[PDB]
Ligand SMILES: CO[C@@H]1O[C@H](COS(=O)(=O)O)[C@@H](O)[C@H](O[C@@H]2O[C@H](CO)[C@H](O)[C@H](O)[C@H]2O)[C@H]1NC(C)=O
């Protein structure tokens with residue numbers, strides 16, 4: 001069951017998104033989206049996509065219906081059947097992705113932080129909790 | 134403990150200080166300090182001080198050698214003999230304290246965030262992890 005929730009006051013430099021979860025033994029890929037609307041085709045300020053099937057972690061944005069320029073993280077800090085903790089930190093420069101006990105990747109802002117209205121966590125993932133700090 | 138770490142690039146909005154450890158069986162109090170210098174006698178932008186004995190968590194700053202006005206968090210989110218996790222998040226407004234799963238307290242800036250250069254953790258506390266993202 002996915003987490004999809006509205007952010008009334010949007011997000012700000014200092015906003016922290018904490019995702020504690022579990023990658024299922026049959027999992028292929030799951031996603032963490034910071035969205036600008038409620039639609040399935042809304043703009044995405046951030047698309048965080050761990051892919052167990054291809055052993056990649058793809059960062060991207062989405063504007064006017066098109067995925068932007070793909071960025072990729074160093075290695076895959078995720079594993080089928082293993083728990084994870086992910087911090088997504090909105091700074092004034094971009095989003096910092098923290099997995100485990102280390103800084104994983106920095107994703108520079110392509111869309112203004114002011115446009116982010118919604119958080120989505122879904123895909124092949126089992127959730128313990130999703131927090132907005 | 135006493136963990137003393139420098140922050141060379143300083144800290145900007147979007148910085149997270151994660152402290153993991155254990156509160157001792159007969160702990161009285163411990164502290165987390167963000168100092169505006171490399172020495173302990175430096176000014177404190179933030180004094181995070183859980184007091185297990187008087188059952189309170191005191192927030193304050195130190196300027197020219199004297200404490201500012203004391204703030205107190207809602208109750209004590211710490212239990213003696215139990216492990217804890219604390220997030221200290223820097224934003225535009227101030228510092229956001231997160232203990233466990235709950236946003237605990239917002240401490241609005243008194244000293245400029247750009248003055249912070251050192252993290253100090255000490256007191257009755259067994260540290261397991263101190264990290265800055
Ligand atoms: C042109 O098709 C697109 O190719 C990308 C690169 O594929 S790869 O195998 O060389 O890595 C794919 O990433 C892309 O897949 C889509 O990627 C976006 C993020 O950029 C998002 O994760 C989508 O869920 C994913 O399908 C693929 N696009 C399509 C339409 O297939």
Ligand SMILES: CO[C@@H]1O[C@H](COS(=O)(=O)O)[C@@H](O)[C@H](O[C@@H]2O[C@H](CO)[C@H](O)[C@H](O)[C@H]2O)[C@H]1NC(C)=O
Nearest residue numbers: 164180182187189191192193194200201202203204
């Ligand atoms: C009147 O002296 C000051 O009283 C504060 C509240 O007293 S209490 O009875 O409600 O507990 C004390 O917190 C304060 O102690 C100092 O507080 C600062 C943070 O503001 C810091 O924790 C110091 O380590 C602590 O001594 C006390 N002030 C002084 C100067 O003793």
